[PDB]
Write a protein that binds this DNA or RNA. Structure first.
Lengths: 58, 149
RNA sequence: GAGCUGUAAGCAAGCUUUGAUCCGGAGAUUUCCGAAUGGGGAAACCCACCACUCGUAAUGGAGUGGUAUCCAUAUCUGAAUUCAUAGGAUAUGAGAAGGCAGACCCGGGGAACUGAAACAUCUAAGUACCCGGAGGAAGAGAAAGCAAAUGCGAUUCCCUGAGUAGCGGCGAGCGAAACGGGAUCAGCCCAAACCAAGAGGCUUGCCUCUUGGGGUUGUAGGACACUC
RNA sequence: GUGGAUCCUGAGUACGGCGGAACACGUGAAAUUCCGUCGGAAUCCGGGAGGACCAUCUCCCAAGGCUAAAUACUCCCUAGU
RNA sequence: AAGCAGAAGAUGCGGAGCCGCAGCGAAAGCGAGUCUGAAUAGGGCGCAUGAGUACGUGGUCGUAGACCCGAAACCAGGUGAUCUACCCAUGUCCAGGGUGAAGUUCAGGUAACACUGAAUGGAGGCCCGAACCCACGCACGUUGAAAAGUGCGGGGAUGAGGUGUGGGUAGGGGUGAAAUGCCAAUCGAACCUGGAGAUAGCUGGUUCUCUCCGAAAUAGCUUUAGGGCUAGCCUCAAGGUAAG
RNA sequence: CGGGACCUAAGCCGAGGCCGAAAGGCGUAGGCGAUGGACAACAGGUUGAUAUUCCUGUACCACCUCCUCACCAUUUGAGCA
RNA sequence: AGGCCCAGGCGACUGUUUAGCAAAAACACAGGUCUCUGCGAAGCCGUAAGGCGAAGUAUAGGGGCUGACGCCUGCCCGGUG
RNA sequence: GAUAUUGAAUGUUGGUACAGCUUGUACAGGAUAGGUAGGAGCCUUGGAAACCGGAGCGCCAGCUUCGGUGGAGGCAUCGGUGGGAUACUACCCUGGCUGUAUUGACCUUCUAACCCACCGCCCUUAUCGGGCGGGGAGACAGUGUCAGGUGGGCAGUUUGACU
RNA sequence: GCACAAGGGAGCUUGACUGCGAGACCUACAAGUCGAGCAGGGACGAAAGUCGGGCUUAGUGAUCCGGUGGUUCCGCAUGGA
């Protein structure tokens, strides 16, 4: 589960609430399963939104 | 993102109506329908080239046409047609007769619609025939008719 | 260079000065399982297909080789769908899976007991553990750096700085850097701009697409013109 | 080596708001860096840093890549303590 | 010091670096003065009554497990449904006797089936009772034959039934006709290895001899009362020295 | 004869594939998996240990001709499934 | 190979349970009742796929309370859902 | 709930690039005076005076305007006012409106993406998925971020001493 | 303990001041209490002389962290902040 174009994957980190508790948390990626012609043909794979805007064609 | 429209958005925009078109919807619709094309350096340069080419073509087409057309139109042309007593002409030389005259005499090759004459000359004299050489420029043709035999 | 066919007594029988046993260098062979790879599998078990060979009058049977998956190149096919693709078939592939040493290291996850005489921030600690990769070392590395002087010039590691600054329920506790002195010593290529050739698109006289020539810097450098 | 007619010097990136992590640094005035979202620059007449920030000054050209040497370890081998 | 040459050494180079000789003030800063202060005033800290530095022995302290043994417990990674709980697929077992439903046929009988009586009937989480299963009342055993039994009697025994084989549910969990029950003789949170030599203001132990001196069980504080700091009491060394 | 060169349930494995920090989980095709289904031997003796396996008789199941035989057919053409 | 009778309490009954102290008045049971759910049901397992519900479709499936059969479940919606 | 995935309209309320212009008195006064320069002149059949309706303003003084009937004269330096003179160029935003394109938001209908646990074909002996073709909704939902409310379902803890 | 008023009253005033402070009590520590006297301005009083809170003992709790006013202070190169 990562963007095929760039190395964008699910990262991890803490979740500091009031009193600075240290509950563990995960950070996802805003990626969608849209059609892109990464190869000679379209494949409908995951791709990051940040990379989708003004980037590779759909 | 910016696009080079190929057809109407709110009216035919083949001239490249550069705009901002909601990149998502822009891509989806314009690409699925071919309504436009990406506004990159290559496509922009191609559009500019095609546009300047057609502009110069039209400019030349109008320039070459107006000049000699008017210059020659400033000449005198004459023909002959029988007439009766009392000046009652036996016929009338319409635009078709004048077109045939200019085609067989001077070889001007002007369309019968571009050169029109509704009054239907019935007089045995001289007359100036305006012409729609250009939507903004026009010239007259000094036509003449005289008795025959 | 004269005892030796082990530990291990032997009982028996044999090899050795044409040179044994023995020592070292390079080789042959290496049943089955095992990443195990033809299929299955209760590890060392069972069952096959295609070729060559043995044998029977035939089956039946037996010996050698090939027959997993992923990935790269190429060839033939190539449905919905008309071309075309997905997909299928074939040949090349010291390519690759697995542990290893209970160690060193790069990164992703990631605790609690404990201490604070309780305890939640904090400490424990990015420790243990788990995961993926290689090397003999790995990481880093030639300043968009330090530094504030008639200034040093890639990283790395050692002594100092220093338990000083600073951080901290300003608690417990945590903890530097640079200068300085040392061990070593090496700096280099690409993109960009421009130019030669060709290809496709006609961006129709313009555009990018590929190999090559090119140049790499902050006293700014390169292209361009020229001197070399 | 000479000139600044003209061109280039690494973009969805440097950074910014939001929620985190590591830098001795616990969000504190918090520089610098990495992260996941959105916004988004100049490009030499330019840009970054000097522990918030601004002007002068000083140093350097990031968003491309490689680099042995001094460094850590021993499962094992040879010799010796 | 690092480091260089040197037998893993001593030695030589290496003054990079640290401490003292000047202190005061938070700091600018001043300087045997300085700070405070309006102020030659007064007072705080110092000199004038200079001695520190580097090694080695010993006492003590702080960080490492830190005096030796001792937990219950916590986290991470793994093994377990061959016992037991439930579920799934497929087989197997229930000797004998009794009861007698619905229904069906016939007879009576009503205008008509309603209704009654005879014949077959063999349903039942039916009855009594073997194998099998569960243990409920009592005795023996409790260093037993057995880390949960035996002897007598007891309940169910054709439907919520017992049982063989194979398979699934693995702990911050599963299962449970539900008791805090079972999960390999361990379960209010299974077992193995690591963190880990966890921590323990708690108990126990702490190994040769002589000699000089010689206490306490008291005050304050304390998330503290069986703990800890200061003071009180003891000892060792150097000074004032005759103050007690 | 109990099982393998016969089939299959639960369940597991599982190309491709879908998911997910990694490790990995799910699952199509396909295949494993009897505790099921189909399958050809029975009756008398033998030794100290084996026996519906050895000996003595009668038999059965699957398959091929070196031969044997009768049938059809060699293209509305036998035969196989 | 049955001791029986009189009378009351508890539980409609048969069944299940604290292996290894308590077999019961405990649990469940058929029944009643309230509530949720219109089908990619709701609920549940799982980070997500993928699955149970269910090769079901409101007379069907889940959750709570009471437990056959005869009579009834009376008042209060101020407080909390 | 905001944002990316995720836009097209019909109307709609602000602001931009074009546009349309009007609001102005302390009194003195014939009055409604804001000034700074140019100022001895201007409109008049492309028509005075008067008349009436409507639009606007307002310190209710009144003015202006536009719609038009009626038609040959109105206005102005100069006479006086007071701090400052009335005809043409402008501004100070005191004052309200309409049109075109973007611009952002509000509330409306459509479809393009997104979905498919709806189908037909092929991949393919496949109830997985994935390409095509129809239909269903559709800027929704799902997904990643940020925030608010609920949350013993779950986790780490605390609950003093003298007596 | 106060009638020599510390208890009553009448006038003027704010010493209910600023820097200090020889030396003492109490105290494990922190802390608390008295204080003649010096200097700068004052009040009362002709003067002397008194006034650094109440006739005297309880009327109040630290550190850290925050807020307000004044500063010959410092301010990560320079000048500011």
């Amino acid at each position: 589960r990562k963007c095929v174009i760039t190395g964008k994957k699910t990262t991890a980190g803490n979740n500091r609430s009031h009193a600075m508790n240290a509950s563990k948390r995960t950070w996802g990626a805003n990626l969608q399963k849209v059609r892109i012609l990464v190869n000679g043909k379209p494949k409908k794979v995951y791709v990051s939104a940040r990379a989708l805007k003004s980037g590779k064609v759909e | 993102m910016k696009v080079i429209f190929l057809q109407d958005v709110k009216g035919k925009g083949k001239k490249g109506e550069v705009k901002n078109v909601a990149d998502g919807y822009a891509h989806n619709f314009l690409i699925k329908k071919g309504l436009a094309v990406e506004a990159n350096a290559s496509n922009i340069s191609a559009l500019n080239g095609q546009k300047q080419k057609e502009k110069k073509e039209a400019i030349a087409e109008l320039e070459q046409a107006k000049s000699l057309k008017e210059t020659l139109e400033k000449l005198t042309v004459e023909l002959s047609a029988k007439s009766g007593e009392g000046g009652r002409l036996f016929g009338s030389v319409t635009s078709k007769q004048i077109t045939e005259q200019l085609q067989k005499d001077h070889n001007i090759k002007v369309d019968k619609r571009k050169l029109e004459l509704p009054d239907g000359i019935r007089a045995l004299g001289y007359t100036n025939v305006p012409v729609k050489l250009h939507p903004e420029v026009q010239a007259v043709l000094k036509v003449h008719v005289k008795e025959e035999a």
